[PDB]
Amino acid sequence: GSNSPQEEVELKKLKHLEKSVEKIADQLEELNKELTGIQQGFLPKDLQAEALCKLDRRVKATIEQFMKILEEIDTLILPENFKDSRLKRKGLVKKVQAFLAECDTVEQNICQ
Amino acid sequence: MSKGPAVGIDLGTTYSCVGVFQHGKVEIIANDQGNRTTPSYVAFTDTERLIGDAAKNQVAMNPTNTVFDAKRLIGRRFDDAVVQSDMKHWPFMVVNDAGRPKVQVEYKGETKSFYPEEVSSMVLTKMKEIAEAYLGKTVTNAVVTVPAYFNDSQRQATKDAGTIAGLNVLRIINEPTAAAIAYGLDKKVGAERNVLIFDLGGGTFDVSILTIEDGIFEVKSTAGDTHLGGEDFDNRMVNHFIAEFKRKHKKDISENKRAVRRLRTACERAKRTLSSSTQASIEIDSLYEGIDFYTSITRARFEELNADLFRGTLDPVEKALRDAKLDKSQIHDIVLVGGSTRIPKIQKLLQDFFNGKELNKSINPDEAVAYGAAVQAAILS
Ligand SMILES: COc1ccc2ncnc(N)c2c1
């Protein structure tokens, strides 16, 4: 094996980032449930549109938190020999981008 | 909380800084987020009002209701050429109230307007609080700085912002005067000294020439560019990288706002690296259409991309010397202020202009103006 103590520092940074992504992802899931809650709820059609648009501040905050994670990930410089670090970084960026595309779907379904 | 000392405040266009003289030294005070400078930003939302870091951190979420650049409006009439040109570029509204400008926002679901001095009073309240949190004592006395070119109305409106914030403004002093005080240029033995202050930071470029004689400061001339700073240097790097992505991948990333933002954030940080290293590396995974962007830039390439902008900083210097009726050989002291003066090419262009004369630059250039204001606040105590 060629696994170095230096790579452990980078993997520890990436784990922390994966932990923050899970927390933002939990907020996106609570927003998805609240959106469904309005759609399958007791309010009439007009008040439903207003309740849905009230989630705009919250979806924009989730999008912003995911953008700040990408910016933090973009500060990392990982040598070619840091294979596990590079695989973990790429997997995290792709995961965040798939979450960003779900946020965009929510944005396209509110305040229309 | 018992009574505390007097502080010095640099109330800047995009950022503000507060310092205190204690134990024979100036200490620049960190804010609640551990930052030695605080954004001159105020945000209005559906539930609250936010100041500093908390306001700039949500600008992308709420651009229309987040105010900054109040200093560009303070003490001005609505029909001022500067107000008219500037507003076109701000996401927030600027309205006319009986000849005076007001920022108009949506706050707690209502349309509300504020005068520039009310916005600046909120930033000053935050600077006051920052000082109090560190000292664990009440802060009332302050020296607040203004540009040397500010007129009667702009100086009075700044003083009113201090008054509304509950501050006893001991003195309103010019930013180049505070920078000269920071380096103790007024304590040097001899005859009259001619000082040039080159200030490149906050998004503004100011050149001032002063004369100091037995503790008395006189402004001889001012010159510069109101819209020149680090963002312009970052923009050139963004343009360069966008062109590079087209050459390598035959794809245009410029219409994707998130890809441009990721590239822009990494360019700002690479620029900072290039002030102390000769090369910077950037790695951005899945930047656009799943393409990873791994690249580098040398200091020399960064200098070539900004060559006209860097060279152009000398025109205001030439102009300032002409209006002061001084030759460049008559300048006793040159002071560097503002974050962008850390750029080695700028320092080189200025030193070569003054035929190899050493520059005053040991004080953090982002903090130098607050440093001088803190010393002055202590001398006035
Ligand atoms: C705040 O720290 C820095 C460091 C280098 C820099 N180099 C160039 N421009 C800056 N504003 C800058 C700021």
User: b/e per residue, B186-208, with b = 16+ CB within 10 A?
Assistant: beeeeeebbbbbbbbbbbbbbbb
For A76, the closest of B265, B283, B292 (CB atoms) is B283
Alpha-carbon gap, residue B86 to B169, rounded angstroms: 29
Which amino acid is residue B66, in one-letter code?
Answer: T
CA-nearest of B94, B105, B101, B120 to B48 is B105
Burial of B79 (0-12, 13-18, 19+ CB in 10 A): exposed
What number of C-beta contacts closer than 8 Å exist between A and B? 44
Q: Is the CB of B345 under 6 A from ligand 1?
A: no
Closest-CA residue in chain B for A79? B283
In DSSP notation, B153-209 reads HHHHHHHHHHHHTT-EEEEEEEHHHHHHHHTTTTS--SS-EEEEEEEEETTEEEEEE
Separation CA B340–CA B336 (nearest Å): 9
Residue B32 is given by DSSP the state T
Q: Using a CB-CB distance cutoff of 8 angstroms, which residues of chain B are in contact with residue A97?
A: 286
How is residue B359 annotated by DSSP?
A: P
Look at B258 and A74 and tell me if their CB atoms are within 8 Å.
no
Q: Contacts from B100-103 at CB under 8 Å and sequence distance 24+?
A: B101/B73, B101/B76, B101/B77, B103/B67, B103/B70, B103/B73
Residues 6+ apart with CB under 8 A from A43: A51
Name the experimental technique. X-ray
Judge whether B261 is closer than 8 Å to chain A, CB to CB: yes
Q: Cite the DSSP H helix spans in chain B.
A: 53-56, 81-87, 116-135, 152-164, 175-182, 230-249, 257-273, 299-305, 307-312, 314-324, 344-353, 368-379
Q: Tokens representing B41?
A: 């930003």
Token pair recorded at residue B343 = 């750029």
Looking at domain B229-312, which CATH architecture does it have?
Alpha-Beta Complex (3.90)
Beta carbons of B366 and B132 less than 8 angstroms apart: no
Partners of A72 in the β-ladder: none
- Please tell me the distance from the alpha carbon of residue B293 to that of residue B242, in angstroms, as a whole number: 11
CATH 3.30.30.30 is the classification of domain B68-122: yes
By three-state DSSP, how is residue B11 classified? strand
Closest by CA position to A95, among listed A66, A75, A72, A71: A66
The answer to whether the CB of B119 falls within 8 A of the CB of B107 is no
Residue B11 backbone class (left: φ over 0; alpha: ψ -120 to 50; beta: rest):
beta
Question: Candidates 3.30.420.40, 3.40.640.10, 3.20.20.150, 1.10.10.10; correct CATH number of B188-228+313-360?
Answer: 3.30.420.40
B300 closest CA partner among B374, B361, B240: B240
Q: Determine the distance separating the centroid of ligand 1 and the alpha carbon of B275, expressed in angstroms.
A: 7
Q: For residue B339, which atom of ligand 1 is closest to its CA?
A: 11
Q: Which class for B60: exposed (0-12), middle (13-18), buried (19 or more C-beta within 10 A)?
A: middle
Integer CA distances (angstroms), B378 to A37, A103, B207, B368, in order: 60, 53, 27, 16
B246 is in an annotated binding site: no
A63 CB neighbours in chain B (<8 A) are 61
Question: Roughly what angle, to the nearest 10 degrees, separates helices B314-324 and B344-353?
Answer: 30
Q: Are B179 and B337 in contact (CB under 8 A)?
A: yes
C-alpha distances in Å from residue B154, one per residue of B69, B121, B147, B148, B210:
14, 14, 9, 11, 20
Beta bridge partners of B23: none
For B24-49, b where at least 16 C-beta lie within 10 A, e where not — what string? eebebbebeeeebbbbbbbbbbeeee
Output the CA–CA distances (angstroms, integers) from residue B168 to B3, B9, B28, B122, B171, in the order listed: 13, 12, 20, 15, 9
* Cα–Cα distance measured from residue A37 to residue B113, given in angstroms and rounded to the nearest whole number: 37
- Breaks (C–N over 2.5 Å) after residues, chain B: none
B335 φ, ψ to 5°? -115, 130
C-beta of B272 in contact with ligand 1 (< 6 A): yes
Q: Six-digit token pair at A96?
A: 């965040």
CB B174, CB B145: distance < 8 Å:
yes
Burial (CB count <10 Å: 0-12, 13-18, 19+), residue A15: exposed
User: What is the distance between the alpha carbons of residues B31 and A64, in angstroms, rounded to a whole number?
Assistant: 23
Residue type, A76: L
Tally of CB atoms within 10 A around B268: 14
Cα–Cα distance for residue pair B130/B8, rounded to 1 Å: 12
Q: Which of B104, B199, B192, B107 is nearest to B147 (CA)?
A: B199
CATH topology of domain B1-67+123-187+361-381: Nucleotidyltransferase; domain 5 (3.30.420)
Neighbouring residues of B327: CB distance < 8 A, sequence distance ≥ 6: B321
Strand order in the sheet with B110-114: B93-97, B100-107, B110-114
Find the helix or strand (DSSP H, E) in which A66 lies: helix A56-73
Question: For chain A, which residues make up each domain, given as ranges?
Answer: 1-112
Token readout for B40 is 């001159």
Query: What CATH number matches the domain at A1-112, 1.10.1370.30, 3.40.50.300, 1.20.58.120, 1.10.150.20?
Result: 1.20.58.120
Distance CA B258, CA B239 (A): 15
**CB of B33 within 8 Å of any CB in chain A?**
no
Helix (H, G, I), strand (E, B) or coil at B43: strand
Domain boundaries, chain B: 1-67+123-187+361-381, 68-122, 188-228+313-360, 229-312
Question: Which stretch of DSSP H or E encloses residue B67?
Answer: strand B66-67
- Residue pointed to by tokens 């202050």: B197
Q: B200 forms bridges with which residues in the sheet?
A: B205
Q: How far is CA B182 from CA B172, B201, B273, in A?
A: 16, 17, 26
Minimal CA separation from A6 to chain B, in Å? 18
**Residue B14 among known ligand-binding residues:** yes
Intrachain domains B1-67+123-187+361-381 and B188-228+313-360 with the same fold: yes
